[PDB]
Amino acid sequence: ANQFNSAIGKIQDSLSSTASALGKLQDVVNHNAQALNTLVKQLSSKFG
Amino acid sequence: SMTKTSVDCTMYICGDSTECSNLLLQYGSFCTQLKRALTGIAVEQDKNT
């Protein structure tokens, strides 16, 4: 009970201080955001 | 892992002429997506090792 409760408390302190562990899920937002923002800039170019 | 390659937009399409690069900027982001896709392969080839 000293080992298990202290090990799960380090997980809660790491996710609050550092957001870099969730950055694999942040790329899934960023792969969808950079695909939509590049697709809407196709109308500005004159295509020849 | 595979062989990591990179393709330039300027040297492959244009022969370093001034008339080729003027009409290349009207096409825009066509080779910008193709350059960053091969960059994203070469990051993941190092993650496989």
Tell me the layout of helices and strands.
The structure is cut from a larger assembly and holds two copies of chain A.
Chain A: H1 2-17, H2 23-39
PDB class: viral protein
Keywords: SARS-CoV-2, coronavirus, Omicron variant, B.1.1.529 lineage, spike protein, viral protein
Entry title: SARS-CoV-2 Omicron closed state spike protein in complex with S3H3 Fab
What is the number of helices of chain A? 2
Q: Using the alpha-carbon principal axes, give the shape of chain A.
A: rod-shaped
Give the oligomer, counting copies of the same chain as homo and different chains as hetero: part of a larger assembly
Category by helix and strand content of chain A? mainly alpha
Residue share in β-strands of chain A? under 5%
Largest interface: A-B, 8 and 7 residues
Query: Cα-atom Rg of chain A, whole angstroms?
Result: 20 Å
Number of strands of chain A: 0
The residue fraction in helices of chain A comes out at: 55-70%
Q: Helix-strand pattern of chain A, N to C?
A: HH
Alpha-carbon distance between the two ends of chain A: 71 Å
